[PDB]
């Protein structure tokens, strides 16, 4: 195959409590080797591998480069976060909720899959009930699944045995929902 | 290591000698806000919300990518031309929404652990190459500095059609196929 030489620059802003606690880490990467970075908690560029000292020392010796980078914590991280607050952080997409068994015969173990799909943001609460009892064991959940289109999905599975005439419900709470969604599955 | 309520990349910047080619995108909490079409000098936002209320100067990306090109040539010299290592991508296929026959849906092909960031992702329907109804993300960054990429196939679930996601990458000996069908 053809040889490839790869360079990455990643400027990353970490936010907590709005813009009150912010950390900026800029990372300089050759192929997959991060060789220099700026960390606002450190306040100067640092070499991280032997490839880095000529870069870090140069940028630290250029006071306007150094000073501009320090200022980016405010002029980029916090600045752009204000723009996220108007859009991204107000995006609300309601989940669709579906139940299906994983074939179903009465006294035989089965898995009930509550599919919770196409929601944003990521915070969600999904609870299984058997009649009026909340199921706190036998629940197996996928990790949060990132669809790449600014929605998530998650599958929450209940290990159970269909008996007559049990009724199962999946209860979904999400910041997009004024009231929880309740979907039910009835044995036979 | 870094605990935060939110994480942004206000520059995922990429330049590579193969092509050569580059990418400039912003990410917020792991999703791609936009990439800049570097040839057309156009910012391409990834949601209608973003297209109507946000603006980003494409020259910023062009300038940054020019710096990476400069930096890359310095580090090639300093490393005696140490080339990128080909990694083995991991592929998963799943549906966007619960499947019911006759109800339009979307298949999702996640191609993870991509390095270097050069890949072909295509779809097969009953063994036939799919030419329409396919879209994909840019390369999305990962904290180990590989990438992932996601491809989308619009489809109509039926009892007679099955799907494969087909992935070509230098880290693979042959094209990798990931199969999916309505059960």
């Amino acid at each position: 195959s053809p040889e490839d030489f790869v360079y990455q620059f990643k400027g990353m802003c970490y936010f907590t409590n709005g813009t009150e606690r912010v950390r900026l880490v800029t990372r300089y990467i050759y192929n997959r080797e991060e060789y220099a970075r700026f960390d606002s908690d450190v306040g100067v560029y640092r070499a991280v591998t032997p490839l880095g000292p000529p870069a870090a020392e140069y940028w630290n010796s250029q006071k306007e480069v150094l000073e501009r980078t320090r200022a980016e914590l405010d002029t980029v991280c916090r600045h752009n976060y204000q723009l996220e607050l108007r859009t991204t952080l107000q995006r609300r997409v309601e989940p669709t909720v579906t139940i299906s068994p994983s074939t179903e015969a009465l006294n035989h173990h089965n898995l009930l899959v509550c599919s919770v799909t196409d929601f944003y943001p990521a915070q969600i609460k999904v609870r299984w009930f058997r009649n009026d009892q909340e199921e706190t064991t036998g629940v197996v959940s996928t990790p949060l699944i990132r669809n790449g289109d600014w929605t998530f999905q998650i599958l929450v599975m209940l290990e159970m045995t269909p008996q007559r005439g049990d009724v199962y419900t999946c209860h979904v709470e999400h910041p997009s929902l004024q009231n929880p969604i309740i979907v039910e599955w009835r044995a036979q | 290591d870094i605990v935060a309520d939110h994480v942004a990349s206000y520059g995922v910047n990429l330049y590579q000698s193969y092509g050569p080619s580059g990418q400039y995108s912003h990410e917020f909490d792991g999703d791609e806000e936009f990439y800049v079409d570097l040839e057309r000098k156009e910012t391409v936002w990834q949601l209608p919300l973003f297209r109507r209320f946000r603006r980003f100067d494409p020259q910023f990306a062009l300038t940054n990518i020019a710096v990476l090109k400069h930096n890359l040539n310095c580090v090639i010299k300093r490393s005696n031309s140490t080339a990128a290592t080909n990694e083995v991508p991991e592929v998963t296929v799943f549906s966007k929404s619960p499947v019911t026959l006759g109800q339009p849906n979307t298949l999702i092909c996640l191609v993870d652990n991509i390095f270097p960031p050069v890949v072909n992702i295509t779809w097969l329907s009953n063994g036939h190459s799919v030419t329409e109804g396919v879209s994909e993300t840019s390369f999305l960054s990962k904290s180990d500095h590989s990438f992932f990429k996601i491809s989308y196939l619009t489809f109509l679930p039926s009892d007679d059609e099955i799907y494969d996601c087909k992935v070509e990458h230098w880290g693979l000996d042959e094209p990798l196929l990931k199969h999916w069908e309505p059960e």
Partner: peptide, 15 residues
């Protein structure tokens, strides 16, 4: 208000 971005530091090396 326009989005801003983090400027990539430029290496100083012989061309």
């Amino acid at each position: 208000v326009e989005e801003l971005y983090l400027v990539a530091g430029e290496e100083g090396c012989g061309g």
